[PDB]
Amino acid sequence: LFCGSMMATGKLLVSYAPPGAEAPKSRKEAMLGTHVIWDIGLQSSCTMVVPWISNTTYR
Amino acid sequence: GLPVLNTPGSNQYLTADNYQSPCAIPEFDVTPPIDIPGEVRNMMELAEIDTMIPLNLTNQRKNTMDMYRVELNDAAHSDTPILCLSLSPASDPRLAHTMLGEILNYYTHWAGSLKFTFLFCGSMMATGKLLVSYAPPGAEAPKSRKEAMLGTHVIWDIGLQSSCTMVVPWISNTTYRQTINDSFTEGGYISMFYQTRVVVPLSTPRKMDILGFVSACNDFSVRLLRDTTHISQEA
Amino acid sequence: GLPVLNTPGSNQYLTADNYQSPCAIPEFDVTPPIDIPGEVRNMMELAEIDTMIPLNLTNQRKNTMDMYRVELNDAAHSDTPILCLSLSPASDPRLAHTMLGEILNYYTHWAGSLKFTFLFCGSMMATGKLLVSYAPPGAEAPKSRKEAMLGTHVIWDIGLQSSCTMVVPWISNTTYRQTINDSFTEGGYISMFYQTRVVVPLSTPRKMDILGFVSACNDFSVRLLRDTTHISQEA
Amino acid sequence: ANNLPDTQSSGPAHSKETPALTAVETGATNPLVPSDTVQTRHVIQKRTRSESTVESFFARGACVAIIEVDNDSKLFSVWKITYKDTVQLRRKLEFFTYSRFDMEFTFVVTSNYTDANNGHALNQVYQIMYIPPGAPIPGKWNDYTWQTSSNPSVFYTYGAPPARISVPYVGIANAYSHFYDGFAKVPLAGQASTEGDSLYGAASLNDFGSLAVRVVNDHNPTKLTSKIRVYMKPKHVRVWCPRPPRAVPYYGPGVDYKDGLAPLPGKGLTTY
Amino acid sequence: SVRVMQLTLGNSTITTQEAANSVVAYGRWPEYIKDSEANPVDQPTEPDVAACRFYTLDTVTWRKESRGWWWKLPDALKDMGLFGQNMFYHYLGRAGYTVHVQCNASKFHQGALGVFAVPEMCLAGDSTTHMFTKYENANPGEKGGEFKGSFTLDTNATNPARNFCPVDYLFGSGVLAGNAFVYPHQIINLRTNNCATLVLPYVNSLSIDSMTKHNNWGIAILPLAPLDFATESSTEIPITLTIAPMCCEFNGLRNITVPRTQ
Amino acid sequence: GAQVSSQKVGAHENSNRAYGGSTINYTTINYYRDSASNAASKQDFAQDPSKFTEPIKDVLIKTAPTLN
Amino acid sequence: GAQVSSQKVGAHENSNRAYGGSTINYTTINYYRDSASNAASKQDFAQDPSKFTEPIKDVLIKTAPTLN
Amino acid sequence: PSYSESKRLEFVAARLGAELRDASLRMFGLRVEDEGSYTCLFVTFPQGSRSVD
Ligand SMILES: COc1ccc(OCc2ccc(COc3c(Cl)cccc3Cl)cc2)c(Cl)c1
């Protein structure tokens, strides 16, 4: 949820990287995994779904 | 053999003829075509696409990106024109180099309606009303909003829809006009004025640009293919 | 008589024209044909027959029967190429003089698949596995079996069936390639390596030859008839 | 190549439909007609776009080369086939990115004595031989290459109507590229800088081959010069992807520029 | 509405609340090669979700003084995940794209960016030698290049730069920039939209080509109306470029290509 | 193998032949096997400029608001 | 005595004449009694290369062992 | 400059731009890959798709 004023704008990148590689430290690495580019505006919130990507049937 | 009689014109070479001739590479296996996107059938299709007009040909702005920018400001209302143009699409320096003008320079005659679209590039907080006008030839070229308002005009209110289109209808004596500056086939004048004034609140830029676009309407046509003066070759 | 108009091209002589002309020996009793064996209808039929490739153009072997022999031996396994070739059927010196290359030199464009057949001429007691490869253009030409194995390849096991064929598929950007060495229409690389090694028992020759053959596949075609550089005439 | 629509009469309006307002940011052009912004009368439109069809625009023989031969190695000349040696046809073709058509070539041949009061020669016959990329190029005006057993040749007799031949669509691609944003080679890592280097925007080093022209008659000590002006006309035309036309002077085969970079004149913003 | 959208490709989603529709170049949506237009006979590879996803290239910053930026496709994506891998492992490659340019500001900012997608976007060089720009300079990758306000001839004969000199009003190729609107485009006018979205089909005179030797599309971004804010002579707003290849199919697999650099 | 098309008469003579009959038709016969040898028929079609003028994904009406 | 054959159209004009009608046909008439005077029709057939490529007595399948 | 495959070659001309051609070639090496002979042929917009052996 964005709690800035109405006059504030911006675009953010929310990301999810399945295990096994180096944890993303730059937008460049994060953008290679599951991600949602959130544009701020009227709809105040943005949802990113972290899909079930696993080797085992249960964690 | 069969008796024949040679008529005048025989053995000549008309650069615009349309005859058959022997093929120098017979039985050649021609590469078939593929469906490439963006095929064109008529040159007029290109004349109907909006192209940006280099409206500001002042010495410091001509031949730079600034020739396309016409600046407005939040000054108090004035009746003086923001810009002036002559409806000579192929010859007026501001129209002659647009996609429309470029094509018209390969033809001797043009006829049809045109449309000018203006884009407001000020901030969202800026408002204003402008009067775009078209005056058919024959009288004094409008120098005040009072004269311009007596001809064809569109009062543009600035807001959400950023642009406004003014159609310059085909109003002519001759069935076709010439692509050169000639008084007999003169087209008239285009001008813009402030209806009210550009108004902005505090912390907002007081000067902004507008960009102009020109394209042909669906009743536009050209004829008599000729050579353009827009390309030359020395030696 | 009937009024006619002479068009440009009149009275010229196009070396590739196809017109009628008067017969200088009228009513001549032509000798009828007989059914002679081996008639040909298309030049491409000849390009589809296996012809031996002069693979060994080294200074001592070129222009001798040894230019056709590529020698192998029972040495321990090595990753270095036995031979290297460029897929320029009309221009590569090793391909340009085969029946296929000879025909391609009478045309400007070629397209289609090719096949290389290799014959093992060692004794019956000799065994071995070889890797024949084809790498489409664009990367470094393979210099080790490791790089070659990443492209199109056939692993040939030597035995009863003395020969092995590797088809070089038509993989091209352009619809037709040129019959000259040109990078824009480059074809790739052909190379051979030892998969295991040639093994022979005692009292058996440790070195033997293999012969290579090249022919066109059924989807091969050429176009634009031109003159060959393979024949000249001084004075 | 057809008709234009009629103008329908249009009366006054007072509605919530505003075709005059738009938003060019979308990338679209507002399809307005006069009746959208003014009151119009009914006009039965009889004008057509018959002459602006892609075919009619190119249906003209344009000069692409002037080959010269001096019948006293100049006894023969070779011209690398191209449309970029001249500017007029080139600029028209470049309104599009790709094209596909057949070609008609007409040859206008002129000759004259260099000397006002010296020499004489019998009527000349010319041989225009097409040398497809790969075929042997003549070294002398009379070597074996002029036998043309496979190359197409045109023998022109001076004074006869201009010679003319047709050529099919000969491209190795599905269309001719007026612009090629690439190279014929990719330099690989490790190779010498001399290696893998090629011209930007160039495809084959020899795209269409060239023309070899010579006078077949035995040359006389008389000073004579001939010029073959090559005219080409694209027929059965199809073109793709329109581009803005060339605004500044051409500077070579590429899109390079150097000299006339300030094409527009000055004009007052508020001057009609 | 014309203004709210969501684009999903593979594992990547893009949302926007201030769009101005989207442009599909020449009205053609990207597609795979049909059997009737096929050329190479070998079985193609189609990475699908692994290559056809949104890749975010480096963010550039727009200032009052910016002249413009340009990129080449597939060049700008050559180092992007599995798309780049497939590009270098295969002799031939084909792909369409969804270009999404991002640029947000505020209601007190002004400026308009013209985003053009140009087929065969050949640029002008810097020397008197024709077509002299070298491969390494013509293919900058994800960082792309910039437009200049004037032409400046490289005179160093000993060490020629062999680079491009794209003058902005000449569209970097000797044509007037105002006519660049004949190419598929959108305009990011700060008072109207956040972005520009263009769907580009594969355009070429062949069905498939070498992606390393040839760039099919060029992306040019020019400030049509310069950036301006309140009273801050100092203003900088970033422009992020996110592109997703579509309908990728490669032919002619061999060892990997490693092009020469810098 | 003759192709008979009609001409688009511009200037009309004071004849009925200027308005009808074979007098406003023209005849064509190809003499060469290769289509390249043929002249241009010039009976060329047109098309919709939409691919250039409105390459928009979500179709919009001019009367209706473009930005919705 | 006219022979009317059809051409194999390579480059197509933006006409329907480029796709059909007598506009894609060509006409031929022989003027000489001797067949030698005739031009070449060029409507030439092909054949099986087998007489050269596989002049083998006992026919063999490529999938099957050649040496059996 | 394009090397038509004789791996043992060195090309030294001011290329990728232009000059034009007073070009020098070099063959190393180092075995007697002898003669035989060699030719040098140029191409030209005017008459010169030709030269001498
Ligand atoms: C995109 O625009 C283009 C594309 C290709 C072009 O040239 C291709 C071309 C190929 C072969 C020949 C050979 O033509 C000839 C023959 Cl067979 C015999 C005698 C004379 C000639 Cl002249 C001529 C032109 C040109 Cl000029 C413009």
Swiss-Prot record, chain A:
Subcellular localization: Virion; Host cytoplasm
Boundaries of the shown chain within the full protein: 459 to 517 of 2207
Domain of life from the UniProt record: Viruses
Subunit-level organization: Interacts with capsid protein VP0 and capsid protein VP1 to form heterotrimeric protomers. Five protomers subsequently associate to form pentamers which serve as building blocks for the capsid. Interacts with capsid protein VP4 in the mature capsid. Interacts with protein 2C; this interaction may be important for virion morphogenesis.
Name under which the protein is recorded: Capsid protein VP3
Role of this protein: Forms an icosahedral capsid of pseudo T=3 symmetry with capsid proteins VP2 and VP3. The capsid is 300 Angstroms in diameter, composed of 60 copies of each capsid protein and enclosing the viral positive strand RNA genome.
Source taxonomy: Viruses, Riboviria, Orthornavirae, Pisuviricota, Pisoniviricetes
From Swiss-Prot, chain H:
Entry PTM: N-glycosylated. Phosphorylated by Src kinases on tyrosine residues in the ITIM motif upon ligation. Interaction with TIGIT is required for Phosphorylation.
Induction: Transcriptionally regulated by SHH.
Residues bearing glycans: 22, 37
Family of this protein: Belongs to the nectin family.
Oligomer and partners: Can form trans-heterodimers with NECTIN3. The extracellular domain interacts with VTN, CD226 and CD96. The cytoplasmic domain interacts with DYNLT1. Binds with high affinity to TIGIT. (Microbial infection) Interacts with poliovirus capsid proteins.
Cited function: Mediates NK cell adhesion and triggers NK cell effector functions. Binds two different NK cell receptors: CD96 and CD226. These interactions accumulates at the cell-cell contact site, leading to the formation of a mature immunological synapse between NK cell and target cell. This may trigger adhesion and secretion of lytic granules and IFN-gamma and activate cytotoxicity of activated NK cells. May also promote NK cell-target cell modular exchange, and PVR transfer to the NK cell. (Microbial infection) Acts as a receptor for poliovirus. May play a role in axonal transport of poliovirus, by targeting virion-PVR-containing endocytic vesicles to the microtubular network through interaction with DYNLT1. This interaction would drive the virus-containing vesicle to the axonal retrograde transport.
Free-text note on domains in this protein's UniProt record: Contains 1 copy of a cytoplasmic motif that is referred to as the immunoreceptor tyrosine-based inhibitor motif (ITIM). The phosphorylated ITIM motif can bind the SH2 domain of several SH2-containing phosphatases.
Miscellaneous section: The V-type domain is necessary and sufficient for virus binding and uptake.
Protein name: Poliovirus receptor
Organism of derivation: Homo sapiens
Gene (UniProt): PVR
Full protein: residues contained: 84 to 136 of 417
